[model samples]
Target chain A: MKISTKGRYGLTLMISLAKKEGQGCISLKSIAEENNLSDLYLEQLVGPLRNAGLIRSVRGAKGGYQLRVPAEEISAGDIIRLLEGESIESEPPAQKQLWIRMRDAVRDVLDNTTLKYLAEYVDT
Target chain B: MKISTKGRYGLTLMISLAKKEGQGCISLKSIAEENNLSDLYLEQLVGPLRNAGLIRSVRGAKGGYQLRVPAEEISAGDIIRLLEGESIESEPPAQKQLWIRMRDAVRDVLDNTTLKYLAEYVDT
Candidate 1:
C-alpha cells in the first residue's frame, strides 16, 4: 500500500488544524499559500473531510474549517485511510505476508502517531 | 511510497526464480500463466530487471530469466526501489519525521526479507 498525494496533503490539512488548536476556523486558501499547495485541490479535499465527520465547516464571513474532534483523537492513519481508499487485498499465497508485513509496518507509524503528536513535533 | 503493479509483479518473477534456483531459467510465459498475470507486462518488466543487474536473461531454446545473484542476497527493497522509481522527497518540515519513520519501518521489512526467505515461506 502507498500513501497517495491526496493522503499526504490531507494530513497536512489536519496538521494545520491541529496546530491552530484554540484558534478559530482556518481558510483553506491560507493553508494552500502557507504550504505552497493548491487552493483548488484543498477545496476538493475539504468536502470529503467534512462528510467523513473528521472536520466541520463554518458558513460566515469569519468562518472556514476546524477539526471536529480533539487533535489527540485523530491519527494520521485516520486521515490517510480515508483519502487512500481501501487497503490492498487479494494476492497470491506466495506474497500474502509481504502485504501483511508492509501494511502492518506502515500502519504502526500512521495509527500510532496522533495529530496532537504531529502538531507538537519540533526540530530539536 | 507505494509498490505498484510493476513492483509487485517483479517480486513474483523473482520469487519464481528463487523457488526454481537449480532448475535453469524459466520462461516468462509460464510465470505469467502460473501467477495469472499478463505475459506482455512481464516482458516489459524483464528489461528493467536485467538492466538493473538483479536478474539475467538467457538466449536459447531452453532460455528465459533467473536471478543474477543468490536469492538470499537480494532484498525486496532492492527490487521495489528500482521499479517504484524513487522514494518520497521534498515535503514540509512538519512531516519530515513522518516520512523518516515510514521509510525506515517499511525498509525494515523490505530489506530484511530476501527472496530466499520469501520463497521458502510456507503457511503453517
Candidate 2:
C-alpha cells in the first residue's frame, strides 16, 4: 500500500491545525504558504474534513478553519479515512482473510495515534 | 496510504506460488487463468520479484516461476518494499516525526506477516 499525496497532504493540513490549536483559526492559504503546498489542493482536502465534523470554518475577516474537537481527540486515521475513504475491508475471496488482517493491523495504529501525539512529536 | 494494484497483485502472485508449493512450477498463464488476472500484468510484476531474489524462474517446455525462499521465510513487507520502494521516510521537516511514526507502524505489520501466514489464513 502506498500513501498517496492526498493522505500526506491531508495530514500536513491537520497537523498544522493541531499545532496552532489554541491560537485561533488558521487559514488554508497560510497553511499552504507555510508548508509550500497548493492552497487549492488543501481546499479540496478540507471539505471532507469539514463535512466529517473534524474541523469547523470561521467566517469574516479572520475567517479560516479550526479543529472541531481537541487535537488530542482526533487520530491520524480519522483524517486519513475521511480523505482516503474506509480501509479496504472486503477483498476478493482469494485474498480476503489476509487483507482483513492487514486492514486490522493498520487500523490499530491509526486509531490509537492522535493528532495531538503527532503535533507534539514534531514540536520536540 | 494505499496498496495499489502492483502490491496487491504482487502479493496475489506470491501467494499463488506459496499455495502451490511442492506442486512443481506453475506458469503465469495458469495463475492468471485461475485468478482471472492478466498474464501480461503478472509478467510485469514478476520481474522485480525475480531481480529482488524472492522468486526463481524455470526455463523450458515446462518453464514457470517459484518462490526463491519458503513462504514462511518471506514477509509481506519484503514484497511491498521492493515494489513500493522504501517507505516514506524523511518527510518535510514539519511532518517528519509523525510521518516516521506512521511509516514505522506500517512496517511493523508488513514485516511481521509472512506469505505462509497469509496463505494459511485463506486456506481455512
Candidate 3:
C-alpha cells in the first residue's frame, strides 16, 4: 500500500497542533518553521485538514492553525483519509479475485484504526 | 495507504489455490484462468509467494502449485507485504511531523491485521 504526501504531511501538521494543546491558535508559518516544512506546501495540505474539521485556523497577522477538536477525539486514520482523500486504499483490477481479497483484508485494518490511538504517539 | 497489484493479485491467487485445496497440485495457468488474471502476471507474483514458503510448486507437466501451509496460517498482511514490498505504506517528506505521525498511525492498523481475517471473506 502507498500513502501520499498529503496524508503524511497533514497528520504531522495535526500532531504539531495537538502538542500545542491549549496554546490557542498557532500560525501555519510557525508550524512550518518549527517542523522545517515548506510553508507554501504546508499551506496546501492544511486546507483539507481544516475542511475535515480536524483543525481550525485564525486569519491575518498572527493568524495560524490549531486543532478544532481535542487530540484524543480525532483519529489518525480520520486525518489521513481526509488529506489523502479516497485513494488511500489500493485497488486491484476487478478481474483479479485475489487482489480483491487482499483489498478487503487491508481495509479491515484501516477501517478499525482511529486517530485517538495516534494521539498517544504525541504524548510519548 | 496503497496496495499494489502483486500484493493484491498474489493474495487472490492464494485464495484460489486454497479454495481448490486437496485437489492435488494445480497449475498456475488454471489459477490464472479461474481468476481471469494474466498468466504471465501471476507467474511473476508467485515467485515471491513461492519463496516465502506460502505455497509449494511442482515441476513438469501436470505438476502445479498448492499451499505449503494451511489457509488459516497465512495472513493477508503477510501476502501483501511480500508482493507490494516495503513501499506499501506511504511516506511523506521527513520534514513534515504530521505525516510521520500519520504513517505510524496507518502502520499500526496494517501491522495488526492478519490474513486469517481475509480468508473469511473468501469463504463468503
How high is each candidate's TM-score?
A: 0.77, 0.72, 0.63
**Candidate 2, residues B39-122: lDDT per residue as tens digits?**
887888899999988888887825499888899999988888777774434244545655566567667878988888877774
For residues B1-124, what per-residue lDDT tens digits would candidate 3 score against the true structure? 5657576678777766776666778788876777677788888988998898988887674538988888777766677788886231333332234435445554555455444444444322
| Candidate 3 CAPRI classification by DockQ | incorrect
Q: What stretches of model 2 exceed 4 Å from their correct place?
A: A1-7, A37-54, A57-59, A86-94, A122-124, B37-41, B45-60, B65-68, B82-94, B122-124
Locate the minimum summed-lDDT window of 10 residues in model 2 chain B. Answer: B86-95
lDDT of 1 by residue, A46-105 (tens): 778888898888678343788888989988888888887723343446577787797898
Docking class of 2: acceptable
lDDT of 1 by residue, B1-124 (tens): 4668788888888888889887788988888887677888787777888888888877783548877888888998888877776333435566778878988998898888888988988786
Worst lDDT run of 10 residues, candidate 3 chain B, spans B86-95
Candidate with more favorable, higher lDDT: 2 or 3: 2
Interface DockQ of each model? 0.47, 0.36, 0.19
- Local accuracy of candidate 3 as per-residue lDDT tens digits, A1-124: 5656676667767766776777777787876776677888998888788777777776664658777888777766677678776231323232244434445544455555444444444322
- Candidate 2 chain A has its poorest 10 consecutive residues by lDDT at A86-95
Angstrom error of the Cα, residue B87, model 3: value is 11
Colliding residue pairs in candidate 2:
A1-B2, A1-B3, A2-B2, A3-B1
